[PDB]
Subunit: 188 residues, 2 copies
């Protein structure tokens, strides 16, 4: 009752934080990631290279978050670690996030999300674009929150389902606070 | 020449990586890697392998982009080809054998790759959970060597248009500089940890 009401609230707040960050990014002249590095690359090759990187970056961050929350509970078998990671990075999950954020086919949606994540991280390493890195971190955190909440409702662990949902919900609420305040401080 | 650089590089890589690992093994935190579980029915070893696999994939992707994107001659098929070549079990087994990490014949090709991934994962996690920075140094040096070794083979088997010798020189010079960085870091660590 409490966790389901909280879950509904978190979707509104995540939408507003990520939408606000993304709306600032769209003002930056660096926003069209696909038309950068024109002497060395092309639009289609930049798209594929950003997706190539974003896929692996998402996988590594998802793995670290799976370990962060599950290792606290020895009654959780290792098959749930692989299960949750698979669930977090599959195109269906990415496409659900694509739709919740109104960024726009399930295969295409997942590729676009990965290319966006990769493009944002890379841009922040090659240019002055720390806002893009903030967006990529917040997007991945929402992907993990969204995936975890669904996965543990479908596959509850013995005894601790409610403890681990509360762990992830409290963590995500704190991340949204930190992304909100970073955004505000950025606006000033 | 590039070929006299390559054999020397495999000598120096072995020595630096063995010397870092020898120091890690003197640290009580090494016990926590539980590499004995490679032989057993398993959980912490598999959790480290779970993470190390993803950490290797991300760092290898970063290195692929780092070197290939300077070369417009190199098309995207070689990015995914080089990455697959770098992280596949065959390559990690070759690294297992080159560093003499365990018995070459009793371990299977797949077990060798799992051990390399579990070693990478446990080392990174130990540095995150206990500030064991020597373990993080080793993880980076091992991934750098996996990438050097893979990339050298890959581009000699699949030469890109025009820039074959340039990209191999690029990667060899980079790895020689990394080995110097790892060696000097190790010496600094020994004197005043």
């Amino acid at each position: 009752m409490s966790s389901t009401t909280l879950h509904n609230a978190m979707q509104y707040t995540a939408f507003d934080v990520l939408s606000s960050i993304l709306n600032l990014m769209k003002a930056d002249p660096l926003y069209d990631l696909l038309q950068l590095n024109q002497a060395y690359s092309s639009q289609d090759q930049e798209y594929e290279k950003n997706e190539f990187y974003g896929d692996s970056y998402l996988e590594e961050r998802a793995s670290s978050l799976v370990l962060k929350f599950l290792r606290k509970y020895e009654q959780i078998p290792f098959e749930m670690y692989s299960g949750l990671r698979i669930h977090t990075v599959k195109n269906q999950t990415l496409g659900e996030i694509f739709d919740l954020l109104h960024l726009g086919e399930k295969k295409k949606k997942g590729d676009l999300v990965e290319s966006l994540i990769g493009g944002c991280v890379l841009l922040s390493q090659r240019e002055n674009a720390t806002l893009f890195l903030l967006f990529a971190h917040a997007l991945i955190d929402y992907i993990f929150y969204h995936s975890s909440y669904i996965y543990f409702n479908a596959n509850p662990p013995k005894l601790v389902k409610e403890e681990i949902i509360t762990d992830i919900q409290n963590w995500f609420k704190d991340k949204l606070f930190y992304y909100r305040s970073s955004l505000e401080k950025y606006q000033t």
